[PDB]
Amino acid sequence: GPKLLWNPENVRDVADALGITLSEEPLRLLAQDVEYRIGQVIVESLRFMRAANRTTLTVQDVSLALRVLDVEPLY
Amino acid sequence: DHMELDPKNIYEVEAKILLATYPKLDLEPTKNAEETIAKLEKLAHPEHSHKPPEPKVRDEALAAEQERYMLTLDERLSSKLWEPRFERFKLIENIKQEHAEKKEQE
Amino acid sequence: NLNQIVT
Amino acid sequence: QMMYVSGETGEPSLETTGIIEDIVRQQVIEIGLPWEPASFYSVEVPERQRLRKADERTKAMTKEEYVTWSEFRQASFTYRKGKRFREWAGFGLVTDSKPSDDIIDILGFLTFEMVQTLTEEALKIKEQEDLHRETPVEPRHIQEAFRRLQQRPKKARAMLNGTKLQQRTQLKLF
Amino acid sequence: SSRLTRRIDANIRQMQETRKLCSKIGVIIQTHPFVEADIEPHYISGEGPVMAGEVCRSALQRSVAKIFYHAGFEELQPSALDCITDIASDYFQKLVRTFNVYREAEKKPATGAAAERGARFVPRFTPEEVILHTLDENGHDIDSLEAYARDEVERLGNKLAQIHERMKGHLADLLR
Amino acid sequence: ASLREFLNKMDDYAPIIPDAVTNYYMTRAGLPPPPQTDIRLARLLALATQKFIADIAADAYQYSRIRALGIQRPGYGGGGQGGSQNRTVLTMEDLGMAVSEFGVNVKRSEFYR
Amino acid sequence: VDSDEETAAVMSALANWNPQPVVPQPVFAPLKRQYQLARLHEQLQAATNGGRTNIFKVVGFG
Amino acid sequence: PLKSALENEKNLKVNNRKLIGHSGPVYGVSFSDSSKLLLSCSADGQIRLWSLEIWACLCIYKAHDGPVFRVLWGPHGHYFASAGWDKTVRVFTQDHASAVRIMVGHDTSISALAWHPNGTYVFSASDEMDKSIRMWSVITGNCVRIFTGHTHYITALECAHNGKILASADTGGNIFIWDIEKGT
Amino acid sequence: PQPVPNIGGAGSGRPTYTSGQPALPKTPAFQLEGEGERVLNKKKLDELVRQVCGNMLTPEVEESVLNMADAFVDNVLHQACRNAKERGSKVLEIRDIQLVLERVYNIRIPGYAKVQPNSNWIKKMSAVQAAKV
Amino acid sequence: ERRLKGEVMQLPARDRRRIKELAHNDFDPYDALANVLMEHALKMNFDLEIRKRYAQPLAVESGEFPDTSNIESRMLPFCYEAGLSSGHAPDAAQFMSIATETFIKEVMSAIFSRTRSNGPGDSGSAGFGLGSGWIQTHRYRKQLAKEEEAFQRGEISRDKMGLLPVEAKAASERGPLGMADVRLALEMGDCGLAGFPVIVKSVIYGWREGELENWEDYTYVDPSRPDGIAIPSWEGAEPETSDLLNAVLDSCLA
Amino acid sequence: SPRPRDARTLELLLTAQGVTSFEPRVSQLLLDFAYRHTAAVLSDALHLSSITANAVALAISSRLGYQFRGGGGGYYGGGGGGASKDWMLELARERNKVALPRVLPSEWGVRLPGERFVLSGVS
């Protein structure tokens, strides 16, 4: 696969919390998908920020970005 | 290049095509709403001049019963109570042509 | 050559 | 017997009792007080339609029918069936061995009410179906009753209002 | 100030006094009363609400903390308090939006007596129906709200008074 | 139990939520404040909010109490030394357990590395 | 380890980031169109004998 | 002081007022051709029309899926246009509840809008993988011109009063001046 | 013996000379009552609507409901077949459909028959707790 | 720009190496679009069996709710697509039909409960039972209670469907479900259609209810009114033979 | 002060994209979102099963049916809701076929929609 900005050790820790053992290929696949989702969220957040004629990013913009993508909100 | 058109160059190509289809436009401005109304009246197109669509809307018995009774346990005629495409014959012809071609090689 | 394609 | 007491005097088929047993087993497998105001403190000091219909039916009952009803009222999953019930419910597969007898009595109390509720809803569904056309209860009436019993109060989805999120929960314990 | 806003303060005061009695009994420690501070004098230009998010969020957080102390807790984690405050804000906004959605609904054709009078369209929901639909959609009904605001807190107060009397008797016996 | 009588009894059923908070959030949602809206309707909305919060508190107190092998549930990182004395502490675990029944997810990571 | 070169390299790498997906993003449309187009393709493939016959050919001048 | 036509509001002394009724952030406001009417669009996906004589909402337009980002009155103020997240450009009249024209062909979200001074053409710009400007005819609903060359997010569009020149700006600091008839 | 169906793929009912037969074939299904299925499928939706609200839909809502039914079936089946093939199966079973229905749509149909942390997580939690004191 | 240097040098060398290695990625040819683009522009012949999915009418085309037979006809091509060469279990189609009916009932119940009120009571055999019901108004509640007591005393009789006079009167006033109700219900929640965006977008983008019938219905701006609104109270060339050709083509289309 | 990695990384990535300022609690929001997404995806993949890559891909594909219908995708990229372009083209063809409404100079700027669609009698 490509070079990943996200470290697979985070995914390994998450799988540790749930008692799962992973091989290499599924680990790389999950890391790649997590990276892609982060990118999508950032794109939507920047879209919302620029719609308001601003250069500062607030928590409200990220919340709106999560709302438009059908994601469960964080509180 | 592989393909005739590269997707990344699509928009540019489209742009050029438009230049060859609408070389002239009506760019003169209007001063009031009456002039805009007159211009909209003058530039009407037949293909975009239709009315809005319409709303969506929702004895022989004895002979039919006898006919249905007399068709009991019929495999095909019962189901009906027909577009022939000749697929099998075309397939046979293709197979025969291929076999003849193969034989001609030897 | 986009010109050739358009032509 | 349990169905008979709840107003089902017919002869249900095998499929109906099978589906009822399936539902009861699923429920059993899925399954002062500590949170009272006295718990607010660190020191403790010792202190110091169904019934009316049943009554009407019983009045309408005869002597023999009443005796049969009284005898059938004592049906139980667990009474004198501890080993059979434990094997049926897979106790060792979901919990440590040999839960106390109080748990068994409570489960016996709960299963009877489960069956009673299911029967009483299915009878109403069957009667409403019969009215519109112009025999015992069937599996589709039990399916409709089960679908009704799995609906949750609107308080449990109020935080999804105005959004496009799907509600995902566990099996409701009726 | 109301009958309901009072008697909650009384319940909390009773809780604190009984906890002091418990501390003494266990010995055989000191709490301060709850007081709400106000803002400095403020002026507004024109008629409208005060749009200050920080102060409003802080007041909401204070209210939520008072409710949770009424529930039975004594300590808290700041992140949990922040989470519950966010949830409360979201719930209130959802409720108001529901009311507005029902109020501004599209009209429906008139029938019956209204049609005979010449009317063509009528409101889809009546003023009573708008409120009932809002409460039902958000998980409430008149009977539950009335019971909560009229009986439950008073029952809790009576129970707390009984517990306090029993604890006083126990301590008096113990000292003797 | 009529709505008219309940709205007429709104003097005795006012919640503990200040009017400024009510006005701020009503304006955010889209309703003009009680100068143009009836004060009783705003009081009713605030009372509904208070009832909802009190429900969410009574649960999570039940959850805290039944909890009193033995390791925490992953996904609820929070806390410090753990308080002091035999006092009941509002923790992230109990709040998450309670609000899961209302359709809310509050899971986090405990460490970050 | 020069700090200026390191900073330039890190920022240049971060500026051109472009993640790749694991599975493609779906595109949605009504079922009726899909069924109709499938049927039309079947019929036309049968008619043209898989492309070996030109049925649209015109001989003459009309 | 601002003036109200309501009898109760006779001779009232205030010089600023509030329009309440949107449920999310407001991203556009447009005065109509003294101005009597105001148009607004919000992140809740709705368009609202307000009267500036009684200071209340008159109509809601609900033709969008997702947030609306820009809304614009026409040069003489009976038609108007809107665009936002779902990649489509909509043209309404204040007379009808449903949009009268729909413009399709952008591959990304819309970030800027502009009218032609004659009232028969509209301009739109998209972002991201499709940073182009499109010119739309209102009689047919088709695209007549495409302008390409921007490599940064586009923030503004503006047509000259003579109807012959176009201007655009982006987040890199550049301003592009285009000839409309030649497309160059 | 046990009635046996028709197999081979040649076809049945063709009035030709390609006769071939089983020892005892199964009688084809038939009905001579009068209420056909093509008409009852046009009242099933009305029956369901009667059930929930206790015609009753405009022409434009019935179309959407029928589209809903089509899409639901042609969607659940697609997911379930791939899930069945994943776990090394040559047949489609009710368990796959049940898993899809319960996890994607929250639908449970009666009458058709655990994770724990491991040692590394516990070690990390112990380290964090020791740091917190 | 002197703070960026400190920020970057606060990262350990491992992270800096990992970030710098991103420059080795071979850009985005996005060739994977091709398949998607193609989607838009001894042995068993499984393609022959799979191509049978398009030989049956859809429910929307035939006007019939799907049943066990149609689902059975649909199942096998799906199984052959995925490599399930042994087909399906005999009892799967009935299960699928039951699930489909349950799904539709849930969707319709959710829509109905948000736009209706004053349903039948739980006096007997009619109503919502132990499920989710509707709201009631004060007058309806009073009359329903009075009539229930009267019937219990034996002075009242139900109709052939088992409704009391107040319940039957309330029921008779209801009408068929329209698109305005669906649009209002979709503003409150997903209604169970989160996985079907096309249906939702079809509802949102369509004409409003009653809009096409009353095409010339207008109000006016009037600041002197209560709400500011006033309510008024070659052979055969085309041009010379198009009509005849249209008649023939309409006969052909029928 | 201490600060976890991937937080400095997210903030540097944000800075590299032209953001001149951000609130402190954006990085931890993003980290917790990543945690939740990973947990949900692998919990899904567990039931379809040692877990292979095919199970992970199938879990991702299943999740993609009801969320994440956005992003900055271009030509035939599933953004803005995920609707096909041909469907939108035919909807536009149906809409744009009607004649533009006829307005007199005396009703330009003053005429409104029908009574059914305006906010009358709402107070």
User: Count of residues for chain F?
Assistant: 113
Dmax (CA) of chain K: 76
Interface of I with J in 2-61 (CB under 8 A): 37-38, 41-42, 44-45, 48-49, 51-58, 60-61
Count interface pairs A-D at CB distance under 8 A: 4
Contact I32 B72 (CB under 8 A): yes
Q: Which of K115, K119, K122 sits opposite E121 (nearest CB)?
A: K115
Element (H, E) at H49: strand H47-51
Measure CA K2 to chain center: 35
Contact E4, E145 (CB under 8 A): no
Cross-sheet strand order for the sheet of H101-103: H68-73, H79-84, H89-93, H101-103
Helix axes E78-103 and F19-29, enclosed angle (nearest 10): 60
How many angstroms separate the first and last alpha carbons of chain B? 40
SS3 H63: coil
Residues from A in contact with F at Cβ < 8 Å: 9-10, 13, 17-18, 72, 74-75
Task: Please tell me if residue G20 touches chain K, with a CB cutoff of 8 Å.
Answer: no
* Nearest CA-CA distance, residue J215 and chain I, Å: 19
Q: Which residue of F has its CA nearest to K2?
A: F113
Kindly tell me the sign of the dihedral angle through the C-alpha atoms of F14, F19, F23, F24: negative
Distance from CA of C1 to the nearest CA of B (A): 10
Give every CB contact of residue J53 below 8 A, 6+ residues apart in sequence.
J74, J77, J78
**Torsion on CA atoms B83, B89, B95, B100, rounded to nearest 10:** -140
Residue A36 contacts residue K3 (beta carbons within 8 Å): no
CA F27 to mean position of chain CA atoms: 21
Cα B59 from Cα B62, distance rounded (Å): 6
Question: In chain I, what residues touch K2 (CB-CB under 8 Å)?
Answer: none
* Among candidates K75, K116, K118 on the partner chain, residue whose Cβ is nearest the Cβ of J210: K116
Q: What angle do CA D12, D13, D15 make, to 5 degrees?
A: 120
**Which residue of E53, E87, E93 is in closest CB contact with F99?**
E87
* Rounded Cα–Cα distance for residues E77 and F93 (Å): 11
**What stretches of I1-133 show up as alpha helix (H) in DSSP?**
37-40, 44-53, 59-86, 94-100, 119-132
Q: How far is E116 from chain F (nearest CA, A)?
A: 30
CB atoms E46 and H23 under 8 Å? no
**Is residue J234 within 8 angstroms of chain G, CB to CB?**
yes
Method: cryo-EM
What is the identity of the amino acid at I115? V
Token pair for E86: 């966010």
Neighbours of E89 (CB within 10 A): 22
Query: In terms of C-beta distances under 8 Å and separation of at least 24 residues, what long-range contacts does E47-52 make, across chains too?
Result: E47/F35, E47/H14, E48/F33, E48/H18, E49/F20, E49/F23, E49/F24, E49/F27, E49/F33, E50/F20, E50/F23, E50/F24, E51/F24, E51/F27, E52/F24
Reported structure resolution in angstroms: 2.6
d(CA B48, CA H120): 15
Q: For residue K71, give the chain H residue with the closest CA.
A: H108
Asked if chain F contacts chain K via 3 or more Cβ pairs within 8 Å, the reply is yes
How far apart CA H121 and CA H144 sit, in angstroms, is 9
Residue E85 burial (CB < 10 Å; 0-12/13-18/19+)?
buried
Q: Is the CB of residue B56 less than 8 Å away from at least one CB of chain I?
A: yes
Report CA-CA distances (Å) from J171 to H6, I109, J116, J120.
43, 31, 11, 8
D145 within 8 A of D125, measured Cβ to Cβ: yes
Count Cβ atoms within 10 A of the Cβ of residue E48 and give its class: 0-12 exposed, 13-18 middle, 19 or more buried: middle
Are the beta carbons of I59 and J209 closer than 8 angstroms?
no
**Does K11 contact I at CB distance below 8 Å?**
no
I118 and A13: CB-CB below 8 Å? no
Q: Which two tokens stand for residue I97?
A: 């459909």
Q: Choose among F89, D45, F16: nearest CA to E72.
A: F89
Distance from CA of J98 to the nearest CA of E (A): 29
Which residues contact residue B90 at a Cβ distance below 8 angstroms, ignoring those fewer than 6 apart? G46, G49
Whether residues J195 and K75 touch (CB distance < 8 A) is answered with no
Sign of CA dihedral J159, J160, J162, J168: negative
Q: Which residues on adjacent β-strands are paired with residue H40?
A: H29, H48
Chains that touch I (3 or more CB pairs under 8 A): A, B, D, F, G, J, K
CA–CA gap between residue H17 and residue H12 (Å, rounded): 12
Q: How far is it, in rounded angstroms, from Cα K18 to Cα G14? A: 12
Please state the φ and ψ torsions of residue D96, each to the nearest 5 degrees: -60, 165
Total residues belonging to chain K: 123
Going by DSSP bridges, is the β-strand pair H89-93/H101-103 parallel, antiparallel, or unpaired?
A: antiparallel
Hey, what are K97's tokens? 């076929």
- Min Cα distance K33 → chain B (Å) is 34
Maximum separation of any 2 CA atoms in chain E, in Å: 87
- Using a threshold of 3 CB pairs under 8 A, tell whether chains K and I touch: yes
The CA distance from F88 to F95, in Å, is: 13
- What is the rounded distance in angstroms from the CA atom of residue E123 to the CA atom of residue E101? 13
